[PDB]
Design a protein around this ligand. Structure first.
Ligand SMILES: [Mg+2]
Ligand SMILES: [Mg+2]
Ligand SMILES: [Mg+2]
Ligand SMILES: [Mg+2]
Lengths: 1021, 1021
């Protein structure tokens, strides 16, 4: 009866920050309750640990109040059978919401709305009665969002808050032998929701594992590990502290053993009872052991050496009560003199922020995905990751410990939508709630070597609660620094200056929380801390422009120790069309209101873990080897702090315009932080005209755990020389023949014909034989289908006038009208010459002027010369080029220029100058939200079909017109147009990306010169 | 129904540290809701504030479960009518318990025992319906111990923990017009009890005020005040921050005005809306005003200048919504360079720890008592007080603000009985509970100028929770330092080294938490903080020995800035005997188990606020004026930091053995921290033999608020000279006449006769005329009825062998047997001479030997000479003297020596050498727990009755024998013996008191010389 819903829900615990749990056991590191030492030592599965994952019954309601009393006793008739874990929105019950800052519910702390989607889960299972006779049986929920009540066999058990950490309960007294029934009522909204405003999809349910653990009555209740070293790390001390629960007897003992695989490295045994701590004594129920280790093998992301530690609770006779274990990594993290050091050396963090996301499963995680991520990261030169913005699934840590990644563990607290941001964080009333969120995290994760920094949360302003908590951690775990960006990134609550989106050289001086140029930030008066950006380089859409500026600064300034890119994967969800066709969905695609559209897609990889082209730029800038070329000598520098280049081969190669003249291989032998000089054999000195280029690549001959054999980990290229062409084209035996009509000028030469419309002044058509080559005339183009960065946050309802797009639109760039000023034709002795001049205007203003010359010679080549003038007072244009729709459609694209991937002016360091050949399809970048894409820069020759173009330009080629890209909101809706659309740019604006809600394209990448000149040659084969 | 006990008590909130309150409103400074500015400004009573104090119905039960459902609806038949506030133990319901460290309940956090004394209070009252139409009506409980549930009109309202701070609830929605009924169920024990283990009587109930407050819907919800100054305090800025609750509208305004009595000093008006604090904005519902004040009058305990500040919430038109106010003191507290400064000057704290205690009302406080305490303190030279160990009744602060006392406000947290002491404080699970205890205190008290330091609690070891909380305060209120003694007195959680019971020069090196000599403590490597003892000089019983050593150190070392004596009043309770006679009761007197007996009595004053003699010693050592004598010049030094000696007169006086030769008066004119030289007129130079002494006294001519006219605030005395007596007694015309019997020697001379028993060797009787003068023979005495300090914690069951008493007992001091070694009589020409020698032995060992001579001359004077030898290996004896029971009983006692109050060797600086005359009754000190008392030292002549004694000794005189004192446990049980008992000591051991649970008598005060000599003359008139 007091077990009744009517009674239980009366209290409304979910609308009270004073109640964050009821009957929840204490937090602790991960337990298995092994009953055999070897099993524990080898990480076998323990039988006192059982999964409850699988099929469960589920039913949904609009409000907790609508749940019917019966539910407690009997399964419902209308209940479905569902898989657990999972997020109910993923099964159709309600919609997932994609809002960023703005809370999904109404802001009225600590109330939640009355319609509050309740999900009743239930499960019927069997308990072995052995478990029922002796010991303790508890249930563990790894994650339930956002709050929940629990009943067992009709009996009310407890309540829990904080969707990111485990909730544990003693079931010992509710269990019956045989058949038992759990009834879990999960709520969408709770007072906990106010602390969970992260920018992600808002979902719900039992999204992480469900388990049962059987423990002895007298058990190991907690244990901590710590490593101390001498000056040179030649000697260490492992110190373990163990605590017990139960019946304390003098025959109890604890033993701790450390293993290196198979070898036992150290052991220690002792009886309970600590050292005196105060006037009242010590802890009778704890004991601390100290093991000495000589010449320990250190853990690092470069070489994740691990040890195994076993903790056995036993009697003096030798009889084992239970065993627990963990992997141990010997490393020291410290900040000294402004620098963050690891094992004595200063790190350089190549990081990324990563959310727990699956296009299919929502927020549910699994081994396979986790590993995939890890591999990709490691293969792309990343060495660290940040748990944006809550503790992650337990297994993650282990994987990082094993694979070698530095991790920042972050408390599940984000109050982004409050106003001001610290409205709750500065309130004592919310202190207790915040507290649990930090303490519990620490208690659970602190034995993992890969966690090297603790974070208090995200975007919750700065309040006293933060200071109090920062201090708590500092007292309980002094081995790791603490960081927190809120309230200015440099408050008293952080050991590291960790801004988000601060620029390299420009200051953004917002009131109260300005963001200084990172180089300047360090030098502010009295500042002495290291600086590591918690978030930088917003990878939304076609982005990562300017990435290299950061790397260069990081490399030049000691106290600039790196950052975490934002972010790893796009948060897109899969949906289906009527033909059972899947497509990538974003904010608002589920009828979700309010929503933030594409804002959920900022990753370096697509939801499916397929790479955006930006990933290469990252990989290259983050490479661990650096090169300098001096004469015939290449100087290699290693940025590894601990390892020697012992799985590295250097391949080099010389080519003349794509043609290879010489190749070689040399094995690397560089010590961490050292240099290696590589003497090049005498290089070939061709006579032929062209550009000679040297390219080097570093290859990993042997496979590793995160890479295959032959993995390329770094590269670099240099232009060695250039032989200018002083040649003259030979005589033609004829010259083109001109023909004036009223409508056009027509030039003919053999099968070839070209026609210029006299009213438009454009080359309107051209034939080869009797085959027309164009579907659209060739014309100047000054705009681009806007990128996400060009748009920022400008919405149609709420326009942002500073956004590039808003400015282009308003200046009429998109709707300017060409006006023919002049179109003449003349016959020279060697060719035919056409001259045009056009002006683009808009409402009286002349935005641009384009003057050209076309010269067709007896060889059938058409040379085009373009000179453009841009009104100094018009917003700089996105591009300066030409376009046309070719009639033809071919398979491949071949070019001599930078590649092979998409590259833009402020994102092209990773690209290489060579000869590339790809399928047409590869020249298109399927950004979920479409825009200008696919460009390749520094191109000297382009071939497609029978056509060939030469000059010095940038281009893109595909089946979609700029107009289509710009008018279609999702990639799945684009339709291939009639032929091939080609955009040849003399110049193109950068893409930016320092952030996606303000203009972020640096000045050096804006087309601000006023006058531009370019030229090309078009011909057929 | 959910309002039902069965349901409400089901949760068992009182056995869960996770639930510390339910539906409790937020904390804030004190509100009245004035509706008129002048009323607020003059502190008139506000009508929106109503007391519920008075008669209430009460009923008691053994357990919450035994409360009957009806209670909710209907008053009980068996209910009594009781006064509220009060402690139910004081009304007979159950017993108050006096335990110190050891918890009154079984240690099993967070469970409380099943028998848990429930007190059901109820009250029926009327609500004006005006209050019912508009606004908000809340109820406020200033203090309820230890936990409680509340119902209004049958409806369940909320729950609360923390017996020391106010609990508030919104009654708005439960009130009916007219007749309403409250039903409050109070519990003795709760999980809160684990944090309330202070050494005091354990009581319960509604011990502080009950009120109702009517507030507007749109109100002032909080406000803070702050004062900043320039370098020289010539200019200040008052800064007030105000927050509102309700409906925010643009016509709202806030005005803050500052008044100096009648004069308006400054004002400011503004509309809501703060400055930007972070990326999301500012607080729309707050506003901060800044008033400039030139040449502010500073607040100090020396001159409590106050200002009045008024806060008015109003509309733009001028219509007042509500007003709040407070007294403001302009002062700056800071620690700089190792020193604690106030207004720029380094303090010297003359403090005392004070509990809230009434012999009659228990823990209930009232204005009258509070003021009495304040007066006494101020009159005894105290300037500060510590709220040992919880926030006090609200009015206290105000009184201190007004009278001028520095206060340390202390959170209600003490976990003394845990093991180790920090078992809970170091646990995150208890963090939330601890947190509320600190935050709420700060929120309530922070506007009071007299609070100058915050304290995190007492005897709770040291845990991370403390660090976190220390930091929270530092962030929220940087204007006051934070201190906390636990875990060693010098942890990271304190800004001041604040030990308890550390000695002046000796170290007490306990493991983990040693207590160094305070002079040494400051110099420890790397230490730089100031040192102020949170507790020192344990005033238990006949104590305060050694007080002067502290004052001298404090005065010599800059960083030793004082301390707080332990403690103000004895915690004794009144009881009655069958004749309706009241007596002072202590631990165990109520059948209370377990108990700590007299340990609850450690004050400088008796429960009735009558002074123990130690108070004078304190008063003198703490005096604010110091004197030096050079030649005929007296040099006066002032220890006032802010005031000039403007109500001070110096009276001086010269006397020769008690006879006055010259007197004078001079007015003081000393600036704070200055000197004044006083030239003495030529002093008299008597020829007569004796000691010439100069005495000075400082008098306050005019009354003050805490003193009457003619109050003596300081004194000092010096021996100027001495003229030795070279005189010879004149001839007698006869000499005594001897007579030997077998049994005795009998000497006769006139009416006078003396008899010496030949078997005992003692003067057995003496006559004057036919009147016998003694009831007991004159004999050596080497012991004393033990003081509290002599006993310490030795209990009869659990003996403490280091306690002095244990050592004396064991050496047989108390049961040694005198043995006559020799008894001879001889006739000289001028007198009769008797010689004796005795040995005191015990089990074969000779402890002492006493050799005397008695010489009776023709003048009828008997001169006695005593030479004692003490075995070097026996514990030093308490005293070396003689005693006897005189037959006579007189009215007065007259002596020439130190006085007038009781003084001991290590407690006699406050005493003065003069001629005193008191009533016999005054020579007895009625310590509730009886012991040796009443001594007066440095006595040269003593007169009682017809007798007169001369020499140089110490004595005591009363109707109780040492044996009676030592055998009677309470003062009320002593019975006057037959005549007068006199103890004449040649020497006496010090009393100690650095602590009362270890030997604390310094070596210089132990009778360790081995050989002692003394002499006297006895005669009659
Ligand atoms: Mg809650
Ligand atoms: Mg956010
Ligand atoms: Mg509780
Ligand atoms: Mg205590």
């Amino acid at each position: 009866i007091t077990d009744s819903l009517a009674v239980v829900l009366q209290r409304r615990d979910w609308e009270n920050p004073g109640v964050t749990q009821l009957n929840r056991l204490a937090a602790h590191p991960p337990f298995a309750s092994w009953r055999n030492s070897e099993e524990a030592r080898t990480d076998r599965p323990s039988q006192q640990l059982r999964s409850l994952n699988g099929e469960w019954r589920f039913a949904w309601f609009p409000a907790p109040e609508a749940v019917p009393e019966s539910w407690l006793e009997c399964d419902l008739p209308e209940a479905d059978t569902v898989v657990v874990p999972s997020n109910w929105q993923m099964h159709g019950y309600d919609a997932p919401i994609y809002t960023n800052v703005t809370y999904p519910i109404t802001v009225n702390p600590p109330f939640v709305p009355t319609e509050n989607p309740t999900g009743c889960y239930s499960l019927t299972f069997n308990v072995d009665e052995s478990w029922l006779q002796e010991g303790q049986t508890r249930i563990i929920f790894d994650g339930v969002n956002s709050a929940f009540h629990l009943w067992c066999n009709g009996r009310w058990v407890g309540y829990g808050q904080d969707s990111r950490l485990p909730s544990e309960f003693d079931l010992s007294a509710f269990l019956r032998a045989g058949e038992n029934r759990l009834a879990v009522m999960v709520l969408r909204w709770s007072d906990g929701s106010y602390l969970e405003d992260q920018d992600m999809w808002r979902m719900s349910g039992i999204f992480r594992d469900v388990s049962l653990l059987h423990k002895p009555t007298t058990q190991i209740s907690d244990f901590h590990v710590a490593t101390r070293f001498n000056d040179d790390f030649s000697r260490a001390v492992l110190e373990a502290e163990v605590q017990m629960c139960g019946e304390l007897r003098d025959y109890l003992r604890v033993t701790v053993s450390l293993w290196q695989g198979e070898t036992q490295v150290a052991s220690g045994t002792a009886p309970f009872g600590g050292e005196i701590i105060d006037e009242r004594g010590g802890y009778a129920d704890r004991v601390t052991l100290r093991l000495n280790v000589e010449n320990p093998k250190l853990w690092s992301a470069e070489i994740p050496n691990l040890y195994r530690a076993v903790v056995e609770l036993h009697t003096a006779d030798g009889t084992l009560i239970e065993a627990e274990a963990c992997d141990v990594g010997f490393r020291e993290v410290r900040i000294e003199n402004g620098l963050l050091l690891l094992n004595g050396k200063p790190l350089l963090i190549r990081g990324v922020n990563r959310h727990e996301h699956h296009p299919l499963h929502g927020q549910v995680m699994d081994e396979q995905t986790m590993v995939q991520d890890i591999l990709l990261m490691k293969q792309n030169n990343f060495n660290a990751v940040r748990c944006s913005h809550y503790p992650n699934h337990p297994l993650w840590y282990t994987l990082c410990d094993r694979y070698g990644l530095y991790v920042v563990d972050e408390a599940n607290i984000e109050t982004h939508g409050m106003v001001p941001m610290n409205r709750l964080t500065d309130d004592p009333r919310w202190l207790p709630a915040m507290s649990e969120r930090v303490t519990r995290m620490v208690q659970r994760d602190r034995n993992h070597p890969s966690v090297i920094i603790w974070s208090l949360g995200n975007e919750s302003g700065h309040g006293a609660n933060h200071d109090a908590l920062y201090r708590w951690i500092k007292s309980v775990d002094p081995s790791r620094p603490v960081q927190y960006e809120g309230g200015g990134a440099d408050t008293t609550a952080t050991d590291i200056i960790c801004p988000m989106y601060a620029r390299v050289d420009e200051d953004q001086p917002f009131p109260a929380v300005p963001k200084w140029s990172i180089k300047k930030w360090l030098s502010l008066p009295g500042e002495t801390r290291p600086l590591i950006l918690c978030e930088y380089a917003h990878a939304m859409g076609n982005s990562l422009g300017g990435f290299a500026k950061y790397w260069q600064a990081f490399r030049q300034y000691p106290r600039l120790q790196g950052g975490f890119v934002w972010d790893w994967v796009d948060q897109s969800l899969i949906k289906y069309d009527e033909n059972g066709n899947p497509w990538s969905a974003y904010g608002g695609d589920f009828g979700d209101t309010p929503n933030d559209r594409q804002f959920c897609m900022n990753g370096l990889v697509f939801a499916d873990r397929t790479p955006h082209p930006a990933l290469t730029e990252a990989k290259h800038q983050q490479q661990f080897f650096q090169f300098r070329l001096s004469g015939q000598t290449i100087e290699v520098t290693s940025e590894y702090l601990f390892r020697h280049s012992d799985n590295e081969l250097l391949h080099w190669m010389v080519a003349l315009d794509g043609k290879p003249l010489a190749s070689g291989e040399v094995p690397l032998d560089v010590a961490p932080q050292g240099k290696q000089l590589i003497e090049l054999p005498e290089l070939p000195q061709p006579e032929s005209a062209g550009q000679l280029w040297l390219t080097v690549r570093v290859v990993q001959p042997n496979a590793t755990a995160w890479s295959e054999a032959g993995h390329i980990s770094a590269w670099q290229q240099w232009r060695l020389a250039e032989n200018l062409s002083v040649t003259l084209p030979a005589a033609s035996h004829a010259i083109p023949h001109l023909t004036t009509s009223e409508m056009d000028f027509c030039i003919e030469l053999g099968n070839k014909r070209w026609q210029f419309n006299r009213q438009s002044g454009f080359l309107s058509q051209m034939w080869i034989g009797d085959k027309k080559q164009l579907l659209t005339p060739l014309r100047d183009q000054f705009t681009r289908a806007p990128l996400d960065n060009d748009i920022g946050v400008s919405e149609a309802t709420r326009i942002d006038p500073n956004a590039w797009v808003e400015r282009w639109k308003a200046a009429g760039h998109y709707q300017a009208e060409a006006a023919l000023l002049q179109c003449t034709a003349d016959t020279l002795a060697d060719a035919v010459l056409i001259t045009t001049a056009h002006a683009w205007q808009h409402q009286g203003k002349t935005l641009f002027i384009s003057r050209k010359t076309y010269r067709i010679d007896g060889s059938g080549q058409m040379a085009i010369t373009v000179d453009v003038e841009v009104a100094s007072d018009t917003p700089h244009p996105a591009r300066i080029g030409l376009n046309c729709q070719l009639a033809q459609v071919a398979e491949r694209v071949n070019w001599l220029g930078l590649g092979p991937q998409e590259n833009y002016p402020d994102r092209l360091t990773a690209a290489c100058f060579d000869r590339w050949d790809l399928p047409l399809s590869d020249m298109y970048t399927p950004y979920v939200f479409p825009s200008e894409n696919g460009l390749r820069c520094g191109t000297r020759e382009l071939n497609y079909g029978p056509h060939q173009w030469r000059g010095d330009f940038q281009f893109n080629i595909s089946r979609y017109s700029q107009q289509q890209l710009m008018e279609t909101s999702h990639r799945h809706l684009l339709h291939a147009e009639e032929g091939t659309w080609l955009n040849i740019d003399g110049f193109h604006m950068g893409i930016g990306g320092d952030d996606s809600w303000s203009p972020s394209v640096s000045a050096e990448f804006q087309l601000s010169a006023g006058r531009y000149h370019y030229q090309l040659v078009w011909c057929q084969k």
